[PDB]
Design a protein around this ligand. Structure first.
Ligand SMILES: COc1ccc(NCc2ccc(F)cc2)cc1
Length: 291
């Protein structure tokens, strides 16, 4: 799967909010482009002169994420974050020249991402009470990954002593994205666990934080809530469900070729962090079938 790389696999089946620190610093920002940020401004002007209803929005930038020594007390992860924007994303990661920017970043900074916006996404492996994961079909008319299968998620917009408010907004945003798109009541959702961070190599290496969320509703009840909003209540064109039993071998199915890279990241991390048992009971052959 060359279109997805794992940047972080969390320990302990996934990290809760209270175990994560963020450092939000202008040291973590994109570097100005070698010939100047005027190239980003020009692409934006061209875009707005065709689609004048578009608007810019701030985003978090991922610089790096460092895990504590395994089995340790105290905070377990440090997220190093900067600020970026939708405009900067359109002029860097989305640009036809994005690979030239990655080569220049290696040369100038020893950092393939130094000249990329790299907005931080969020996604969820959302499980039902009857042990299915939730999938969404993307419209064939959107700009990125048209017609592909996705999981719930989005690209959070901003607003350890400002750090803890940032971690709070990241965890809050994955629940809000589930409530907005799947139309689920917030009180049917568990507090999220961070499974890990995946990079989309088809979008010049931008990263998404991938979470596990449990729902107290069954697959049939989730479907009812999704559909009862009507076509204007969701950006996706359909919902569907795969048994957690069958997610284990999803990379061997015809579905895998239809999954967008960030959804592939979510399912790889679910299989490694929540699946793959470590103990004698769940590791026994009748509960963990060989092959
Ligand atoms: C041409 O416009 C596009 C609009 C949206 C997208 N994809 C989602 C998305 C990625 C990164 C973001 F920062 C914000 C949204 C790509 C291209």
């Amino acid at each position: 799967d060359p279109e997805v790389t794992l940047l972080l696999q969390c320990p302990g089946g996934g990290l809760p909010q209270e175990q994560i620190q963020a450092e939000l610093s202008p040291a973590h920002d994109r570097r100005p482009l070698p010939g100047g940020d005027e190239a980003i401004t020009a692409i934006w002007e061209t875009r707005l002169k065709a689609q004048p209803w578009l608007f810019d929005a701030p985003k978090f930038r991922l610089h790096s994420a460092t895990l504590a020594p395994i089995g340790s007390r105290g905070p377990q992860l440090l997220l190093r974050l900067g600020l970026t924007s939708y405009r900067d994303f359109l002029g860097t990661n989305w640009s036809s020249s994005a690979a030239w920017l990655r080569q220049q970043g290696a040369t100038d900074w020893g950092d393939t991402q130094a000249y990329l916006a790299d907005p931080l996404g969020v996604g969820a492996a959302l499980a039902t009470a009857d042990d299915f994961l939730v999938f969404l079909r993307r419209s064939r008319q959107v700009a990125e990954a048209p017609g592909l299968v996705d999981v719930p998620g989005g690209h959070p917009e901003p607003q350890d002593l400002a750090g803890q408010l940032v971690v709070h907004e990241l965890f809050s945003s994955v629940l809000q994205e589930i409530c907005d798109e799947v139309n689920l009541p917030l009180l049917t959702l568990s507090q999220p666990l961070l499974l890990g961070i995946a990079r989309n190599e088809t979008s010049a290496g931008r990263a998404s934080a991938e979470f596990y969320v449990q729902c107290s509703l069954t697959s049939e009840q989730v479907r009812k809530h999704y559909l009862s909003g009507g076509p204007e209540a969701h950006e996706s064109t359909g919902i569907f469900f795969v048994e957690t039993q069958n997610v284990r071998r999803l990379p061997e199915t015809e579905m895998w070729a239809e999954l967008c890279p960030s959804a592939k990241g979510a399912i790889i991390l679910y299989n490694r962090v929540q699946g793959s048992p470590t103990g004698a009971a769940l590791g026994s052959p009748a509960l963990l079938p060989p092959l």
